[PDB]
Design a binder for these strands. Structure first.
Lengths: 153, 240, 215, 5
RNA sequence: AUUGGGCGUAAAGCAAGCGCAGGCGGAUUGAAAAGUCUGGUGUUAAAGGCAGCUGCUUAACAGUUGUAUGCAUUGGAAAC
RNA sequence: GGCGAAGGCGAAAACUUAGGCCAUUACUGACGCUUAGGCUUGAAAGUGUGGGGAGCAAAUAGGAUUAGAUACCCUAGUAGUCCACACCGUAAACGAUAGAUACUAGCUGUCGGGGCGAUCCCCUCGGUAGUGAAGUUAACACAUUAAGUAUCUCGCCUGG
RNA sequence: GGUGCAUGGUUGUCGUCAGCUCGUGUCGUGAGAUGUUGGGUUAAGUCCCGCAACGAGCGCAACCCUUAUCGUUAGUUACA
């Protein structure tokens, strides 16, 4: 685990006089091999907020496979009027991505990839789009299985 | 036999046009009443799957849980079966958020255990009011977790009388990968339920016959004395 | 707007720091203006000793100050160096009319007295170290003594301006409205170059049902 | 499913 | 936002109808191939873009060879 | 609720008369959707003329209210409100969803047509609603009459 | 001497008012909601029933004094 936070925010709620101050932070954790855990948590205290965020991240673990450090198929994730592209590229281009996008691409243990954000650039919506793009990823063996001919073609 | 076609006398019956459409594949067309019937063959194979999987979990020595909260009939049946064999159960309504977390449940049931064992230790030393309210709290704890005290861990298997009537229970069950078996009447979602037994609950005779068969299935696997093993004869129990 | 919970519950379950009686306002003013100076001298001049308390027991031109601390060595010192000096200041501030005597005694589980814990917390805060972690290990090490929930409030500067961000923690069952719960309270002041910070702590040592009356 | 034995 | 945008409540469906041109057009056969795929020929100045070679103490720089683009002709191709 | 593309259409009688639905297993044989321009119709109000004018009621007059009322309360009442002749084209001319088009759970209905029976009530074909699965969206919600899947054509928009 | 717009501490305020929060957990893109909502019952979020919520923290009551009927130990300088 690396448990590197991605986005932090401060927010208040209104009541009868004054505003109660419960800030929220979003964290992403990986294994450098494919496990991904994302979680946002709000709390009165910063260390307790980190504790709850880690709890949520550890409770939302899921692993994804890789193909020579990249994803072989050109696919786009669409979520909340925001799209993220992902496109294979040889070892001579290196990783190229935005900050939070870099956090995702690194924490999952991935490598060189072509990703450009589309739509709005709010952090959480874009993060959701990243997971959405991850989900519909398919593997050559399984798409071969659904074909009557099984030769990875 | 088991799930005999001629053994049963009332398996059909349901309010029409209140059913989820994709449940029509397991039902044959209606004749006159439009009260949802059931193809007894697929019922037989579903019960056979339940029978072999409960034997399998018996070999694994897995924990069994009975979940049912209908008005009186299946409630009385589950209470009798639960006081007959070791199984978790509930009579009160399903508490919101029970299966999803057991740590709070663990500490609460430990509190229940320490209080009841202190009552056992106590010899009416406490005054009338003190032990009066203590016994009231004990009875409240019996109302809450008096049916789920027989386990300290996650429930290895659980039956649902009706996922629609127990939407909270099946929703919690969907969160975890634990095996869940239910009784789809005519209007449930197959993807939520793991193993499907499309039996009826609109009539009490069907419910009693099926629960008797499943209780015998889960009892005889543990090599305890049973009631029905492979006998086509059955006990007739009409609702009061 | 509240009150110090120590004095609210004081004198009914806990006892006094100075127990004495004399003639009505004839010379009692002398004793009651003499004793407080000595006690706060003991608090401020002797920090490392972690003194739990000092009892003043006076009757007709005599004084019996009994100290109760955690480290008698510091108040004694190497080759009993500190005892001669401390006797010097006390007899210079107690007068020749009263006899002098002093000895150190301990008490079972002294780590659950509010005053020494508050003083230790204030001393730790005065080191310009992140406050929250300091209170975190403080609460951990006071709960490790096998007690109930604890209350703490620290009001003062936090990295400069924005005084409106005072910090406090509530733990466990800490009923101050009751009277028979074996509850003590303490308060201390720390002085930085930016201002004065007040710390207040409520220590709970288990509810003490069927206590009866005061000792 | 059915892989619990 | 031709590739590559939207138009229910953030801005955008004309108040609606008739309708030329134009835009898009149901199934099959024959003809040809205008477009299109595509062989070939000529053109697409040099230099300069990318790649390679030589001269530079490395280097910008010079020279050097190929590389692409569209156009006309012509030969197949008949799915649209 | 019915009609139509709508605005709108409600005492009745007649003449004229459009458009609309189902089976069409009788006929031409793609004769089809869109629509620049162009043409047409089109709430109320308004424009000028000839009438009619009970009441209503712009404007205006008086009386009340309040710090005050050219408002709101009342009393009145000119134009206008209706008929015919020509112009008039702004309305939230909102289903805020352009037109046509095939398909995608369903349930409760309503209405018309066909078969057949006493109503009852079965389905078929459409209009008309409510609910709701999938799907959509930012949600509201929509959801076999989509704002869904997609297509064709116009018209429009690119911060205030 | 000036700085309660540098502070601690202190006091009044809503108010002797029942309301105010957290852990877990659920739903939701999310601010957040769900307990604390509803119905009986109380000075009262007092308890109870239902309740995707289960529990916990402050306060409410409790434990402090007094008034009260009477009993006990002791009796003066109260008494008599």
């Amino acid at each position: 685990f690396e448990e590197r936070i991605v986005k932090l925010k401060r927010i208040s709620k209104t009541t009868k006089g004054g505003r109660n101050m419960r800030f929220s932070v979003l964290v992403v954790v990986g294994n450098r091999k494919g496990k991904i855990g994302y979680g946002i948590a709000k709390a009165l205290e910063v260390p307790n907020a980190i504790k709850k965020a880690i709890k949520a991240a550890h409770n939302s673990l899921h692993t994804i496979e890789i193909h020579k450090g990249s994803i072989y198929h050109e696919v786009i994730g669409r979520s909340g009027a925001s799209r993220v592209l992902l496109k294979p590229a040889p070892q001579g281009t290196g990783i190229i991505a935005g900050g939070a996008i870099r956090a995702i691409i690194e924490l999952a243990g991935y490598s060189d990839i072509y990703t450009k954000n589309l739509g709005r650039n709010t952090p959480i919506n874009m993060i959701h789009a990243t997971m959405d793009g991850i989900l519909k990823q398919l593997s050559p063996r399984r798409v071969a299985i659904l074909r009557n001919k099984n030769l990875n073609e | 036999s088991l799930a005999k076609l001629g053994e049963m006398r009332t398996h059909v019956g349901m309010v029409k046009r209140y059913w989820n459409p994709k449940m029509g594949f397991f039902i044959e067309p209606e004749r006159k009443h439009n009260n949802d019937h059931f193809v007894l063959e697929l019922q037989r194979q579903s019960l056979q799957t339940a029978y072999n999987y409960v034997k399998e979990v018996a070999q694994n020595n897995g924990q069994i849980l009975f979940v049912g909260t209908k008005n009186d009939y299946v409630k009385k049946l589950v209470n009798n079966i639960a006081k007959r064999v070791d199984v978790a159960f509930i009579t009160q309504r399903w508490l919101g958020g029970t299966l999803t977390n057991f740590k709070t449940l663990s500490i609460s049931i430990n509190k229940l255990n320490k209080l009841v064992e202190k009552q056992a230790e106590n010899a009416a030393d406490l005054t009338k009011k003190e032990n009066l309210m203590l016994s009231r709290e004990i009875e409240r704890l019996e109302k809450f977790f008096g049916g789920v005290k027989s386990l300290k861990r996650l429930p290895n298997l659980l039956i649902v009388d009706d996922p629609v009537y127990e939407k909270n229970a099946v929703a919690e069950a969907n969160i975890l990968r634990i095996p869940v078996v239910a009784l789809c009447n005519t209007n449930t979602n197959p993807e939520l339920v793991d193993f499907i037994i499309p039996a009826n609950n609109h009539q009490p005779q069907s419910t009693c016959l099926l629960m008797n068969l499943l209780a015998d299935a889960v009892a005889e696997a543990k090599a305890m004395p049973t009631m029905f093993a492979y006998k086509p004869d059955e006990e007739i129990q009409i609702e009061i | 707007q509240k009150v110090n919970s120590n004095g609210l519950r004081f004198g009914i379950n806990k006892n006094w720091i100075s127990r004495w009686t004399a003639n009505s306002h004839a010379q009692t003013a002398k004793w009651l203006i003499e004793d407080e100076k000595i006690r706060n001298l003991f608090f401020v001049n002797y920090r490392n000793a972690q003194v739990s308390n000092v009892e003043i027991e006076r009757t007709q031109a005599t004084v019996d100050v009994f100290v109760y601390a955690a480290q008698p060595a510091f108040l004694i010192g190497s080759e009993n160096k500190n005892i001669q000096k401390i006797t010097k200041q006390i007899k210079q501030i107690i007068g020749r009319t009263t006899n002098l005597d002093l000895t150190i005694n301990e008490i079972g589980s002294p780590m659950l007295s509010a005053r020494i814990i508050a003083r230790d917390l204030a001393n730790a805060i005065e080191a310009r170290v992140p406050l929250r972690t300091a209170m975190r290990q403080s609460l951990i090490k006071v709960l490790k003594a096998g007690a109930n929930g604890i209350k703490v409030l620290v009001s003062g500067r936090l990295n400069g301006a924005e005084i409106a961000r005072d910090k406090m923690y509530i733990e466990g069952n800490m009923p101050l409205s009751t009277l028979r719960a074996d509850i003590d309270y303490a308060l201390e002041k720390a002085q930085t170059t930016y201002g004065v910070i007040g710390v207040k702590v409520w220590i709970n040592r288990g509810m003490i049902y069927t206590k009866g009356l005061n000792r | 499913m059915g892989n619990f034995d």
